[PDB]
RNA sequence: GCUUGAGUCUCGUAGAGGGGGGUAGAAUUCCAGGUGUAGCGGUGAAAUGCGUAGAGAUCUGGAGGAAUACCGGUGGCGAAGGCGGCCCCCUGGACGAAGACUGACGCUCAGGUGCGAAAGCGUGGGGAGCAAACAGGAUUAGAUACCCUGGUAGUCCACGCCGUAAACGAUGUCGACUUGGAGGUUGUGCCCUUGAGGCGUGGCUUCCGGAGCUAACGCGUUAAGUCGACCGCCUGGGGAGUACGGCCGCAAGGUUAAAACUCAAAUGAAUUGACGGGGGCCCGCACAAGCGGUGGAGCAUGUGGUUUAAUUCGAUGCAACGCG
């Protein structure tokens, strides 16, 4: 908004594992205001991600996540008649949430029988650098890196951190 | 500022390039009278002296010759 | 409903930067207090260079 | 002095500017969000780890402690 | 290929494009690269980044002439003109001197009337 | 672009609907892609007035014209609408 | 323009003198003969000069800060 | 008769004042040659266009035309129009110091005569760049336009014509008088030039303001203040600076200049709002970041239409349409 760096509230961590990133991930596919069955989908998917990956579950999810987190993201701008996209760097809070949104959408596609099987296979190919969300990641990097020639005025991401 | 031609009793000759090179810049351009602070009469005599010395090639027009 | 963003200090910066880029070579639309006028002019002179680098 | 979602910005010692990154802060990497883990306005352990002579970036850290 | 030592790097830096012609001391060309031919097209030609990629894609393909040091001439009041010489400090060259060959007429011919 | 006609105290005859529709179609073709148009005809004991609301991509735009015989009011409203459309059209060209 | 010197050099001096006199005269001469409005633009420029000088001078009274 | 008005002479002073001649440098274009190769150019985006027949770039040489960066100064000169590289020749005016001289020789001026930007016209040259007309590409609903790519008259010179301009300070000329300030430019006098110093004195000029004036805006010793001499011009708006006739012009057209008719207004300045594809600042689920919808389907309910014997009446942009 115009005003208000807003008084921000935190979230509850995940019960089964010591993670708030995982609780955010439950809140992403928590469709229709119903947390419990989304928790059953996430747990049911990390179990078969462990059996279909061998390694542990939290590192399985995080290694599967860092192959779809982005670095540069386009912002569409128009000046005059043109309307070109300008690469802004993603801030590392937006980064992993923007990854998990693509994982969850690419799991709502892809359709297998169950949602835990779809999301389990989608995280598996996210470890394999093979699935859909890595194609969307590489689309974002190809068009921001393709439109890389714009670093300008003041409407985006002041001096540094 | 001070006008050095007013500090002398001069009437600017075009041949003392030791003095005229204090009034060309290093690109050959004549320096304004708000910078050097000369009087306007000696500024006109100065400009005619610079252009005349350029004609006799005692001063350059530009630096790209 | 919460409180003002970057309390005119580096908002005074980007007002002087936008006003610097979009012409306005007045440097005569600033604030009047010192801590905001200083970087309205700071953004103005940081915007003159960003006008030289582009059209 | 001000934690900007990727760090904490300790700025003691006579104008030395921007410092500790979110990557160290503990022995966990990404999930930490420094506002949850340290403070606002508090004097801490932080050691230097890099001074870059050009571009005026010292980069302190906080993981250099005793947990592992 | 000629095994030249030093070169003169002309940079034509107009509004809509920058072209970079690396020549020798003599004044005859060795290799050139433009801000249009580096993949950037139309309005995107008119950026400093396309001038930087142009100076890269000239500074190699003049490798076979073996230039250690070069002068830099720059003609044109364009959006390149400084990123393209940062891209020649960074390209592995020794810059002897930098000049300005922007043609300033002691007003002669009449310019066009262009805008409304 | 579908034109909806309604009338408060004005009995919309079939010859009245043919003319209004033709005029609206002609205006729509001339200035911009228009999605829907509502026409309201009011009679208040003297003033034959007309309202129109055009829903166009940019948004709503409205005009109103009082006349003497209903037909005159409709003509005024249509010219006003055309003028408004020119403003909206290159208001969202603005290259 | 012309910069040659020892190992810390090559950028600041050059973009200074280059940028000022270059961008001035080329951005001026690039089009528009005008024949008429250097007269108007110098008249407005210098009327704005005396109005800015007298305006700041009589604006040097107070501002209630 | 007299010297104060006017004019002449002796010294200088500054100045894009005018006419003629000559010459210099940068740049643009073209031509010839070299190196080199895949683009150039252009725009808000594009295409028309140019380029593998070697373009664009870079270097060397040559040709030709035009304008004179910096100095450049709300600076200078000229009656006005206007006049900017540098040098020569011929020539006009202004200014000041000290004297001498003539002795009212003065001011204005209808008719007349002269000068008079740009465009244009005639004759002969010249033609770089730009550029009406014109072609093409776009844009647009259309686009005989703005934008782009080209491009002929013209822009230039010599000799004639035209005689108009927002030819404007929208302020006729000449003269006198009437508080100040800050500057510019150009002379000159005195004194410690002893230091870019101080005190006066003339001319031209820029701004701000005093009384006074003005409908106000504003003008304000360079008046739009107080007066005097002479001239030009005005008498509601449209018709109309048009028609007819005269005079001038090669023509375009210029000048002089009506009337019928028609309306009760037209106008100037200032005010309060409203408005702007004017500006500045702040804010809003206004945009951006997201979540879920409507529009497709069936059904419910309301409305328009159509029907009917009646389909009771009202609510209709937002702010009527599961509304009374």
Swiss-Prot record, chain A:
GO biological process annotation, one example: cytoplasmic translation
Which keywords does this chain's UniProt record carry?
Answer: Ribonucleoprotein, Ribosomal protein, RNA-binding, rRNA-binding, tRNA-binding
Show the PROSITE patterns listed in the entry: RIBOSOMAL_S7
Reported effect of changing residue 35 to A/E? Defective in ribosome assembly
Q: What does this protein do?
A: One of the primary rRNA binding proteins, it binds directly to 16S rRNA where it nucleates assembly of the head domain of the 30S subunit. Is located at the subunit interface close to the decoding center, where it has been shown to contact mRNA. Has been shown to contact tRNA in both the P and E sites; it probably blocks exit of the E site tRNA.
Q: What else is known?
A: The strain K12 sequence is shown. Has been predicted to contact the N-terminal domain of IF-3 based on footprint studies; exactly how IF-3 interacts with the 30S subunit is controversial.
Question: What does the record note on quaternary structure?
Answer: Part of the 30S ribosomal subunit. Contacts proteins S9 and S11. Cross-links to IF3 and the P and E site tRNAs.
Its protein name is: Small ribosomal subunit protein uS7
Curated annotation (Swiss-Prot), chain B:
Q: What keywords sit in the KW lines? A: Acetylation, Ribonucleoprotein, Ribosomal protein, RNA-binding, rRNA-binding
Which is one Gene Ontology cellular component term of this protein?
cytosol
Q: Which domain of life is it from?
A: Bacteria
User: InterPro entries in the record, alphabetically?
Assistant: Ribosomal_bS18, Ribosomal_bS18_CS, Ribosomal_bS18_sf
Cite the GO molecular-function annotations of the record. Answer: mRNA 5'-UTR binding; small ribosomal subunit rRNA binding; structural constituent of ribosome
Q: Which PROSITE patterns would you find in this protein's record?
A: RIBOSOMAL_S18 (PS00057)
- Family annotation (Gene3D superfamilies): Ribosomal protein S18
Q: Which GO terms describe its biological process?
A: cytoplasmic translation; translation
Presence of the UniProt keyword Signal in the record: no
One short Pfam family name for this protein? Answer: Ribosomal_S18
What PANTHER family does the record tag this protein with? Answer: 30S RIBOSOMAL PROTEIN S18, SMALL RIBOSOMAL SUBUNIT PROTEIN BS18M
Family under the similarity heading: Belongs to the bacterial ribosomal protein bS18 family.
Q: What role does it play?
A: Binds as a heterodimer with protein bS6 to the central domain of the 16S rRNA, where it helps stabilize the platform of the 30S subunit.
Provide the assembly information.
Part of the 30S ribosomal subunit. Forms a tight heterodimer with protein bS6.
Identify this protein by name: Small ribosomal subunit protein bS18
UniProtKB/Swiss-Prot annotation, chain F:
**Which GO biological process categories is it annotated with?**
dormancy process; negative regulation of translation; negative regulation of translational elongation
Disruption-associated phenotype: Non-essential gene, no formation of inactive 100S ribosomes. Double hpf-yfiA deletion mutants form 90S ribosomes. A quadruple yfiA-hpf-rmf-sra knockout strain is significantly outcompeted by wild-type after 4 days growth. No change in sensitivity to aminoglycoside antiobiotic gentamicin in stationary phase cultures.
Matching entries from Pfam families are given as:
Ribosomal_S30AE
Q: What is this protein called?
A: Ribosome hibernation promoting factor
| Subunit and partners | Associates exclusively with 100S ribosomes, which are dimers of 70S ribosomes.
Q: What does this protein do?
A: During stationary phase, promotes and stabilizes dimerization of 70S ribosomes by the ribosome modulation factor (RMF), leading to the formation of inactive 100S ribosomes. Converts immature 90S particles formed by RMF into 100S ribosomes. Crystallization with T.thermophilus 70S ribosomes shows it binds in the channel between the head and body of the 30S subunit, where mRNA, tRNAs, initiation factors IF1 and IF3 and elongation factor G would bind; however RMF is still able to bind.
The family annotation for this protein states: Belongs to the HPF/YfiA ribosome-associated protein family. Short HPF subfamily.
Q: Determine if Lipid metabolism is one of this entry's keywords.
A: no
Question: Which gene is the coding source of this polypeptide chain?
Answer: hpf
Q: Which GO terms describe its cellular component?
A: cytosol; cytosolic small ribosomal subunit
Arranged from A to Z, the UniProt key words for this protein are:
Translation regulation
Species of provenance: Escherichia coli (strain K12)
Answer yes or no on keyword Cell wall biogenesis/degradation.
Answer: no
Which NCBIfam families does the UniProt entry name for this protein? Answer: PRK10470.1, yfiA
Curated annotation (Swiss-Prot), chain G:
Q: Does the keyword rRNA-binding apply?
A: yes
- Transmembrane helix in keyword set: no
UniProt keywords, alphabetically: Ribonucleoprotein, Ribosomal protein, RNA-binding, rRNA-binding
Q: Where is the composition biased (Basic and acidic residues)?
A: 57-65
The record's listing under InterPro entries reads: Ribosomal_bS21, Ribosomal_bS21_CS, Ribosomal_bS21_sf
Compositionally biased tracts (Basic residues): 43-56
Q: Please, one GO biological process term?
A: cytoplasmic translation
Which GO terms of the molecular function aspect are on file? Answer: rRNA binding; structural constituent of ribosome
This protein's GO cellular component annotations are: cytoplasm; cytosol; cytosolic small ribosomal subunit
Residue ranges, annotated region (Disordered)? 40-65
Family indicated by similarity: Belongs to the bacterial ribosomal protein bS21 family.
PANTHER family, alphabetized: MITOCHONDRIAL 28S RIBOSOMAL PROTEIN S21 (PTHR21109), SMALL RIBOSOMAL SUBUNIT PROTEIN BS21 (PTHR21109:SF22)
Q: What does this protein do, in the record's words?
A: Probbly involved in recognition of ribosome rescue factor SmrB in stalled/collided disomes; fusion of protein fragments to its N-terminus decreases ribosome rescue in the presence of SmrB.
Quote the subunit structure annotation: Part of the 30S ribosomal subunit. In stalled ribosomes contacts ribosome rescue factor SmrB.
HAMAP family for this protein: Ribosomal_bS21
Name of this protein: Small ribosomal subunit protein bS21
Q: What is the lineage of its organism?
A: Bacteria, Pseudomonadati, Pseudomonadota, Gammaproteobacteria, Enterobacterales
Gene label: rpsU
């Amino acid at each position: 908004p115009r005003r208000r760096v807003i008084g921000q509230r935190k979230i509850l961590p995940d019960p089964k594992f010591g993670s708030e990133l995982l609780a955010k991930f439950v809140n992403i596919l928590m469709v229709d205001g119903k947390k419990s069955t989304a928790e059953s989908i996430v747990y049911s998917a990390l179990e078969t991600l462990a059996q279909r990956s061998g390694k542990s579950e939290l590192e399985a999810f995080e290694v599967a996540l860092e192959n779809v987190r982005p670095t540069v993201e386009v912002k569409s701008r128009r000046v005059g008649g043109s309307t070109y996209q300008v690469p802004v760097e993603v801030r590392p809070v937006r980064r992993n949430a923007l990854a998990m949104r693509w994982i969850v959408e690419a799991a709502r596609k892809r359709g297998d029988k169950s949602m835990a099987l779809r999301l389990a296979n989608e995280l598996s190919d996210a470890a394999e650098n093979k699935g859909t969300a890595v194609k969307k990641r590489e689309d974002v990097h190809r068009m921001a890196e393709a439109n890389k020639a714009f670093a300008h005025y003041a409407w985006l991401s002041l001096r540094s951190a | 500022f001070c006008r050095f031609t007013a500090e002398g009793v001069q009437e600017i000759d075009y041949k003392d390039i030791a003095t005229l090179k204090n009034y060309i810049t290093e690109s050959g351009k004549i320096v304004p009278s708000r910078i050097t602070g000369t009087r306007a009469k000696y500024q006109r005599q100065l400009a005619r002296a610079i252009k005349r010395a350029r004609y006799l090639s005692l001063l350059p027009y530009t630096d790209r010759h | 409903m919460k409180r003002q963003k970057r309390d005119r200090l580096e908002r005074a910066h980007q007002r002087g930067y936008q006003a610097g880029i979009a012409g306005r070579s007045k440097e005569m639309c600033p604030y009047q207090t010192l801590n905001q006028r200083s970087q309205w002019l700071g953004g103005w002179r940081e915007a003159m260079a960003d006008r030289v680098v582009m059209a | 002095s001000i934690t900007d979602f990727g760090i904490f910005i300790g700025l003691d010692g006579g104008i030395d500017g921007l410092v500790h990154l979110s990557d160290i802060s503990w022995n966990v990497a990404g999930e930490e969000a420094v506002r949850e883990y340290k403070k606002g306005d508090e004097i801490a352990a932080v050691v230097l780890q890099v001074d870059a002579e050009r571009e005026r970036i010292s980069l302190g850290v906080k993981q250099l402690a005793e947990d592992p | 290929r000629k095994q030249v030592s030093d070169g003169v790097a002309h940079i034509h830096a107009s509004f809509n494009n920058t072209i970079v012609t690396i020549t020798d001391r003599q004044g005859n060309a060795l290799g050139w690269a433009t801000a249009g031919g580096s993949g950037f097209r139309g309005s995107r030609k008119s950026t400093p980044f396309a001038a930087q990629v142009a100076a890269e894609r000239c500074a190699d393909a003049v490798k076979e002439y073996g230039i250690k040091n070069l002068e830099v001439m720059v003609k044109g009041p364009g959006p390149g003109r400084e990123s393209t010489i940062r891209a020649l400090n960074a390209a592995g060259f020794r810059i002897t001197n930098i000049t300005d060959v922007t043609p300033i007429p002691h007003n002669g011919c009449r310019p066009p009337k262009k805008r409304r | 672009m579908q034109l909806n006609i309604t009338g408060n105290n004005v009995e919309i005859t079939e010859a009245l609907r043919e003319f209004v529709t033709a005029k609206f179609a002609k205006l729509e073709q001339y200035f911009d892609r228009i999605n829907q148009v509502y026409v309201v005809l009011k009679v208040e004991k003297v003033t034959h007035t007309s309202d129109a609301t055009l829903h166009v991509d940019g948004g709503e735009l409205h005009a109103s014209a009082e006349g003497q015989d209903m037909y005159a009011a409709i003509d005024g409203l249509i010219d006003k609408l055309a003028r408004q459309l020119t403003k909206h059209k290159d208001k969202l060209k603005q290259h | 323009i012309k910069v040659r010197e020892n190992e810390p050099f090559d950028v600041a001096l050059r973009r200074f003198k280059r940028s000022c006199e270059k961008a001035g005269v080329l951005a001026e001469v690039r089009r528009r003969e005008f024949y008429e409005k250097p007269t108007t633009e110098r008249k407005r420029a210098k009327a704005s000069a005396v109005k800015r000088h007298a305006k700041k001078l009589a604006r040097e009274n107070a501002r209630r800060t």
